């Protein structure tokens, strides 16, 4: 039965536990998986996950990425004029920058 833990880190494809983890870091209440900054962090880690393993020819998926990043620009563009404090928090903790 010692083969429990030899079921980890290698029998793995999705590895979208990271989304859960960071969404947790940024989540206010519990089961609160749908707020703005939360989606921003999820997009962010998705972009950093996907800007690695695409072959400069999977052009459809690249377009997916492009739609991602610009919807993220929209997310932040609204984020900035509602809770500015949280928005400085956002940029500080997430490495994105401001351009009014």
């Amino acid at each position: 039965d010692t083969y429990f833990h030899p079921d980890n880190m290698s029998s793995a494809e999705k590895m979208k536990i990271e989304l859960s983890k960071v969404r947790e870091e940024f989540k206010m209440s519990e089961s609160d998986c749908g707020s703005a900054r939360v989606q921003v962090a999820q997009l962010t880690t998705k972009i950093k996950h996907l800007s690695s393993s695409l072959h400069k020819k999977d052009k459809h998926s690249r377009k997916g990425l492009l739609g991602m990043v610009q919807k993220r620009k929209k997310l932040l563009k609204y984020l900035r004029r509602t809770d500015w404090d949280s928005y400085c928090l956002v940029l500080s903790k997430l490495s994105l920058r401001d351009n009014p």
Binding site: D1, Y3, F4, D7, E30, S31
Partner: protein
């Protein structure tokens, strides 16, 4: 209320760490070759 669904998902994911995989009926790899064991099913 939806804490209930919280519980439901956590349970369905527990299932005794999935008893099916947690079973004692497993296969050691450093072993006497259950392959070699297979002489009955070798002609199955």
């Amino acid at each position: 209320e939806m804490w209930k669904m919280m519980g439901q998902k956590r349970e369905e994911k527990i299932k005794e760490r999935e008893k099916l995989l947690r079973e004692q009926s497993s296969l050691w790899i450093e072993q006497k070759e259950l392959e070699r064991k297979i002489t009955e099913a070798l002609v199955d």
